[PDB]
Design a protein around this ligand. Sequence first.
Ligand SMILES: *Cc1c(COP(=O)(O)O)cnc(C)c1O
Ligand SMILES: *Cc1c(COP(=O)(O)O)cnc(C)c1O
Ligand code: NA
Ligand code: NA
Ligand code: NA
Ligand code: NA
Lengths: 319, 319
Amino acid sequence: MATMDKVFAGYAARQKAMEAAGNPLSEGIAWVEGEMVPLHEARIPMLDEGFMRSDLTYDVPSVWDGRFFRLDDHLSRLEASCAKLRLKLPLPREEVKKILVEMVAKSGIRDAFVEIIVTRGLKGVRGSRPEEIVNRLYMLVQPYVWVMEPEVQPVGGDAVIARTVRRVPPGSIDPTVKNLQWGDFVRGLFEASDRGATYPFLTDGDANLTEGSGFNIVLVKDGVLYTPDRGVLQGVTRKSVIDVANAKGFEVRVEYVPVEAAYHADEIFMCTTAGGIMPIRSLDGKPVNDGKVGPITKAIWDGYWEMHYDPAYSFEIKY
Amino acid sequence: MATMDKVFAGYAARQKAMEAAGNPLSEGIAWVEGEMVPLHEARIPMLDEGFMRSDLTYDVPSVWDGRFFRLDDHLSRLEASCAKLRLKLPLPREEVKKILVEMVAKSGIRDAFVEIIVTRGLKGVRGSRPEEIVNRLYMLVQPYVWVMEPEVQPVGGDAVIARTVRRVPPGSIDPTVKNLQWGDFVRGLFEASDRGATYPFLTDGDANLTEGSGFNIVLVKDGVLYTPDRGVLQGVTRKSVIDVANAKGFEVRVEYVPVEAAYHADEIFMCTTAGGIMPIRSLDGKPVNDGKVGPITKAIWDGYWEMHYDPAYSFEIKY
Ligand SMILES: *Cc1c(COP(=O)(O)O)cnc(C)c1O
Ligand SMILES: *Cc1c(COP(=O)(O)O)cnc(C)c1O
Ligand code: NA
Ligand code: NA
Ligand code: NA
Ligand code: NA
């Protein structure tokens, strides 16, 4: 369990140093209407009908150890999300990239959660002519967010297959469009908490796994990785999982994963930008296999963080 | 078609008078953090995790001809919406009532769209302890909004049964909780527009009608009114429709309404606070019956606006 120490110890050191620098901007910076403002003072107009009706999409790249991770993948997914929503990125993609690097640089944050939001704008879809709709852009940079805290990743967390809620189906809301309409996920969070666990796994209502509240799901069984194809966000972390798995000779099947498979899996882990590779030790109050972080999961964990220093997948920021 | 003239002519006169008064506050007033501010300057903090994840509920009473319509019904539905979301109205209900009356009074608006929003607050559900969650309140007053403009209600609008999208199911998001997660409704709006119509009727994906983008649906067939029970908001307008129908001896069945019934209906109309009683002359590009506003619909229209002057359902505002 060495590489986790090196990763987490490095993170700790950089957090210790950022508090020492006392920079007020290291609490976060936002981009709103062409202007960079401190995070705790960034505000959205109530007249942004888009934002009001959550008629928007968003995406969250990260910065780790001063390096932006797969930014172009996130920008490309955001553009595809916009197109599916009949939205348009209000600024050229390369300018968004420049602003984001500047914001991270000016903030001094070495490990950052970065968020880009495109909304319909001030005039909503209902009863407005196409000429009158002007999409709006919001961006943000802030310290890295953990869906699983570093102290838990060596042991793994507690999940449940949710039984009081199921995933919004693609015929209502396209799950490949990263969105903030979290009604089902929030029910899943409360259900997990009510049942004495932390992470909800949502079904599709048809006996298959989909995803959870802010993460994709992966099963390991007899040396093969399984993760749902339909009904889920096509995560960039999931993508990196496939890259590491291929590089290490593990097969990954992106396909229909029945709920039943979760109860027989050798290993389970979640993956997401806000936290990385997140092992699950128990499901529905029962141990996953031996209740430990599995070997294939640790290989995926190691490779995922290793690739944060591959220039094919990252670039360094000048602060 | 007299009573529509009296209603719309009165509305016109009051709009003519509000423009004459030139009051800048007659464009709207908002309540944000204890302070009343002009609408075009009201802003929401990006750190409102609730609002960000649309982890909120809301409700929209109206003011017509200087009288608040069924405010207590809306406040009661909002409280029930909060309870289902494990939210709490941050101020006592009677104080919210007082603020809203004051806001309408100070604004001078005689015909108003009024909106109350309760969000999870600055600390979201995920990874926060129950002690750290403080729900936040937002309110707004602005000129009356029409989902169907007065000029169209005498003739009726053009609807379609949506075929590219279906209603979010209650097992994902409780439709009796008025909410702003409009992903499916926005797809329905674009589909309607693509097909040359205006109003989408969403199915439940199981061959029954539910509701539309901001309105309940009612069918009239052989002297009986039909409106879906499950999968929809229990509208206050729908409630008033039942009151008028009962008073006039018409039966209303709140039950499963198959999609097939829409294609054989004698009359169809939508109902919502933002516009009232809204007849539909065509469905899927075909006439509804004779393509005219039907008689039972006009009786419902007349009674609905009549009851805006019944003290059992309204009170007058002192401006
Ligand atoms: C963000 C998120 C994921 C993970 O996607 P990444 O691109 O790896 O961050 C998966 N599912 C949902 C619902 C998410 O919000
Ligand atoms: C607001 C709305 C209605 C109508 O409800 P009222 O209380 O009559 O205003 C119906 N369905 C949806 C989805 C709505 O947003
Ligand atoms: Na996106
Ligand atoms: Na998946
Ligand atoms: Na409500
Ligand atoms: Na109904």
